[PDB]
């Protein structure tokens, strides 16, 4: 048989619940007081993110 004009949509609404998220700070075991092992030494001061101020705008 014919299904006919059936099934209407449902108009709902929003709910802003973002919440304070549960973050964690996992502490890796770096060069501390431990058994006989040699650590690391810095390569150089690269200053890769060196900012600049202005060029031509009098």
């Amino acid at each position: 048989e014919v299904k006919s004009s059936s099934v209407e949509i449902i108009n709902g609404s929003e709910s802003k619940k973002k919440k304070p998220k549960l973050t964690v700070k996992i502490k890796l075991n770096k060069t501390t007081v431990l058994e006989n092992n040699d650590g690391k030494r810095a390569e150089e001061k690269p200053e890769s993110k060196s900012p600049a101020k202005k060029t031509a705008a009098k």
């Binding site: 549960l22 973050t23 996992i26």
Partner: protein
């Protein structure tokens, strides 16, 4: 626990020893998704990672791991 207790996950992975917590930080960075909020501070040697934004796939894999590593 059919689902993952995000609290027991967080407090379960940070209480671990080197071999264990290193295995944790490697799994999260290996399958790092655009949702999970990781911040690796290499200065203090720490992964400030929000597990709350991990996909079910990751928070289950991590849970299984850290739970058999603690219990």
């Amino acid at each position: 626990k059919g689902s993952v207790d995000l609290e027991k996950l967080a407090f379960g992975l940070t209480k671990l020893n080197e071999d264990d917590l290193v295995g944790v930080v490697q799994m999260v960075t290996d399958n790092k998704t655009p949702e999970m909020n990781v911040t690796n501070n290499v200065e203090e040697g720490e992964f400030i990672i929000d597990l709350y934004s991990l996909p079910e796939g990751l928070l289950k894999s991590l849970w299984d791991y850290v739970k058999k590593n603690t219990e």
